[PDB]
Amino acid sequence: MQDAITAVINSADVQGKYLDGAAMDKLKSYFASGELRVRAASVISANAATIVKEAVAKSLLYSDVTRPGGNMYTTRRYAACIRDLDYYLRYATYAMLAGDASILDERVLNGLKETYNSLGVPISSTVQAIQAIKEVTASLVGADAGKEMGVYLDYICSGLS
């Protein structure tokens, strides 16, 4: 994967040119936002389980997916769904810390759509659950950090779309 810093390094090294004013500006921009990224990651780690719980309460429970015939019916499948959601949250936190969506594109979005289609995981309800996670995280971490997390959660949702 690449974070912001290594992404800049790769972009420069492809052309064999030293770090210039533009690359320096990007690196400074990432270096400035590090404190906010780290604090948002700390908060997200503090309330990961709570975030997932509230998200599923808002988006999934008392729906079709939870009743017999729904794909969140059995306890095994409910646990699998909660595990998918906290995986999404944790990898979104990774991407936000790195300031780059590459980690999502490989260690999360690699055949995931094919897997869900083959197993019958409803993509629409998964997207709605991730949107609930986005809303809860934004309300719990702030506005700027909220949209920073929302960028990567939307990246995951688009990867599933």
Binding site: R76, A80, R83, Y87, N110, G111, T115
Partner: protein
Amino acid sequence: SVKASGGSSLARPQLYQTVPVSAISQAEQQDRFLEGSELNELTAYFQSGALRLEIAETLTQNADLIVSRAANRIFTGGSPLSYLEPIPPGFRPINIARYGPSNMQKSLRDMSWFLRYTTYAIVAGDPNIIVVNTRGLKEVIENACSIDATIVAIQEMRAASADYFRNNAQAKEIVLQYFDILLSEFKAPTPANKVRQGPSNDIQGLELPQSYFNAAAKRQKYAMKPGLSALEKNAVIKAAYRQIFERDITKAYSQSISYLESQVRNGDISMKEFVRRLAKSPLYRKQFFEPFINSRALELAFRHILGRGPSSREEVQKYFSIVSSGGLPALVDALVDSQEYADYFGEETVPYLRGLGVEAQECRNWGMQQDLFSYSAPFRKVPQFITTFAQYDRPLPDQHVYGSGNDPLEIQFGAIFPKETRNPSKRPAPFNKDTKRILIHRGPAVNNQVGNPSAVGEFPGSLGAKVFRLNGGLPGAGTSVKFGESSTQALIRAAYRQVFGRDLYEGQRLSVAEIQLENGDISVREFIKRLAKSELFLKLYWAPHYVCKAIEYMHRRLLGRPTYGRQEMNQYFDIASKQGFYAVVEAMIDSKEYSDAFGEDTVPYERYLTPGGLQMRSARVGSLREDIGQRVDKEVTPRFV
């Protein structure tokens, strides 16, 4: 002779399968209680047991008549029963006189043996014994025994045996089914042996008769497939954890890598890739890499990934190089990507311990693999495969004849031996009765009694230990300030330090012996004999130890040297068997060598060391001489100065 031993532990291959063993092993190999399935099998088998024992009773009672009917149908021209130890087109009766007495004996014995093993199979509830010992008997006896004749005899025995069971279709059906299995298996041709080819040129190829595999307990095999039910996938993952980590750490400690499990159960990664990533994980690193030196870590890794221990010196050499270069990831990648791994487990199958009964076994790593497969393997830290393989190629080590555990530390006081079970380190070597251990003299090298047997007793001077002698006269041999009190008491305390290693606590000294020595009534030899035979010596140094450990420590204290080999050890040990501790002490102190080295007035002392003891003393940084084991460059001032 062979120069090393990998150890030898009792091996118990399964001779045949029985219903309780089948069910209990089915539960036990999965690390769980017996469930409804196995318990129900046990209930049904136990219920049928009374009927089965009835069948066995009736057949053993009438075995004579059944065998007689068989022998009469099969043989012609005489009475086969003179000495007891549907029809194939080619069947013809066999003549007793022509066929011969030895072969007639084998015919009758084989018929009775067939009936006996049929009763065994009835009782066991499984025909596995019959299949095992009958598939391929034909080819074993074609050339001296008629196959048509044997078939007709077995058919006659089957009919006669079933004739006793008009009861109902419970006894008759069982007897008929087991005899039908016997018949079809005797008619079977010999199956090919299972070949275990050498994965490389440093490992030999082997083969195992299929009957041996059929008898042994079958290894349960887990394969991850996309279509398995969720419960089956759970069982497969648990098996993978049991293999790689040696137990179910998820059940025990909730330790798990969830994303790897999701990937493998989805089919994103194969079981091979799952094994690769699990064995690289920090869980595996902490449990089976961090606690061990690389040499032992690679042996454990071979267990976990290939289901076997190292096979040769070359293999341990190669893989220790690999782990030295790239550490744990390189080791895991080399093992998992090996042609051998893919040959056995492929992409889907969880690795399994192969060992005895699953395939042909090698002699060269027999004991080491026995140890490796034990659940106590993680607590052996000393490498066992590199050590044993290297010792095969080299002469006998410097070691007690009965093993490394019988060598105590060569320290001032204390009988410290390695404990066989604590941090297992045993290093068996085949010393025959005539080997002699090379000992290092504490003194001038040329005074070693091997090269200079008349040097025995030559005091070692500055190169060896201090020697205490009752050279001066004893007091009272009135007046105060008699100087002969300090020397005699120094010698008494020296004798205590020699026999026990250190001085005793107050109230422990044998005061009567001390006064009887100070009064000239006994000699120094007699006093040390009293010390050695004292109940205190028994409690401290004889009682708490393996008999031969006690003897070895005794020999070191009394003769000032370890034992040379099996001759001394055997004589003292035999005395221990016959007479006991006091007689062993007597034998040591009344021996000729004691008299030669120590008279009636010399306190014993350390005369010799093993190489290990000397190295312990003289290889430390503060005691290691500058000229030992390195090039000493002469320093000269530069010529330009």
